Structure formats: C-alpha cells, structure tokens
Amino acid sequence: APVRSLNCTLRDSQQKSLVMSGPYELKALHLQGQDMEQQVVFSMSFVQGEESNDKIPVALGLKEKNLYLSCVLKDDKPTLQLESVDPKNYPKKKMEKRFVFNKIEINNKLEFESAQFPNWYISTSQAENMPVFLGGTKGGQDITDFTMQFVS
Ligand SMILES: C[C@H](N)c1ccc(NC(=O)C2CC2)cc1
C-alpha cells in the first residue's frame, strides 16, 4: 500500500517554533500570533525500520516539497541537512537510512534520534534564530525534546 503520512508542526520544549529563513535553512524562534503562519509544516511519514511501543521510525518531509531532513557526515561530523529528492519517487515506505528518525515518546515529549547515527538527536539552541542541528550531547544546553501539533 502507499506510505502513511500526517501533517504536523513541531515546537521545542522551550516552545520555540520551526521556520525556513534561507536556502535549505531551518531555524528555531519564539513565535506567536500572525507570524505563526511562518512555521514549517512537516509531512511525517511512518517508514520501514526497527520499532517498539515508544520508538517509531519516521521521515520528516516538508509539506508539498521534495525536501526531507537527512543525517549525513559533513567535514567528518554527523550533520542535519535539508535534502531534495525526485518528487516522482517520494515519499516511500522504505526511505534510505539518512532520512529515518526514531520518534521516541518520553514523559509526554518527543525526541527524534537519527536512525543512521545512534544517540544523535534533532536539537535546538537556547538562543533565538539559530539553526536546527544534530546533537550527540543530551541534557546540556541543547534542547532535544519537542511537542507535535497535528495540522489539517
Ligand atoms: C536544515 C539544517 N538543519 C540547517 C543547516 C544549517 C543552517 N544554517 C547555516 O549553516 C548558516 C549559519 C551558516 C540552518 C539549518
């Protein structure tokens, strides 16, 4: 059958929102009111991979764009990027591993661990208007916990 996908937004546990701000550049900032139209809407696909009650493999595409979050080595470090794909072939159930996140539910929050790079997480900074990034350090200054809002 097709791959199953849900539209959603994400906010970090400090309640910062995710917006595009430049070519392939996703940043996190405090947003409320009219400006909330600026937030990125994801198409979260439920993909093939190792699964348990609280660890669910997903891909995170941008709604109606041929763009996915992906985890690659850059200058020898695990690195979050936006990657373009052939729009004829995506989304699909068997997404390549660089596109796969383990969506983990702990204490009413979500963490997104790289399937490719164990114990590296989608992260934000405490400061406003900085990149969303991959974070191999948890519980420090990096925010690895999120909430999801379902979108029509
Ligand atoms: C989508 C990916 N998470 C991402 C990667 C890089 C940036 N920004 C920069 O690299 C600018 C400071 C030099 C933003 C978002």
Swiss-Prot record:
Motif Involved in interaction with TMED10 C-terminus, chain ranges: 112-125
Induction, as annotated: By LPS. Transcription and translation induced by M.tuberculosis and a number of different M.tuberculosis components in macrophages; EsxA is the most potent activator tested (at protein level). In pancreatic islets, release is increased by high glucose treatment. In pancreatic islets and macrophages, release is also increased by endocannabinoid anandamide/AEA.
One of the GO biological process terms: positive regulation of cell division
Effect of F117C: No effect on binding to IL1R or on IL1B activity. Markedly reduced activity. Markedly reduced activity
One GO cellular component term noted in the UniProt record for this chain: extracellular region
Site residues, Important for interaction with integrin: K55, K63, K65, K74, K88
Protein name (database record): Interleukin-1 beta
Species assigned in the record: Homo sapiens (Human)
Gene from which this protein is expressed: IL1B
Residues of the full protein shown: 117 to 268 of 269
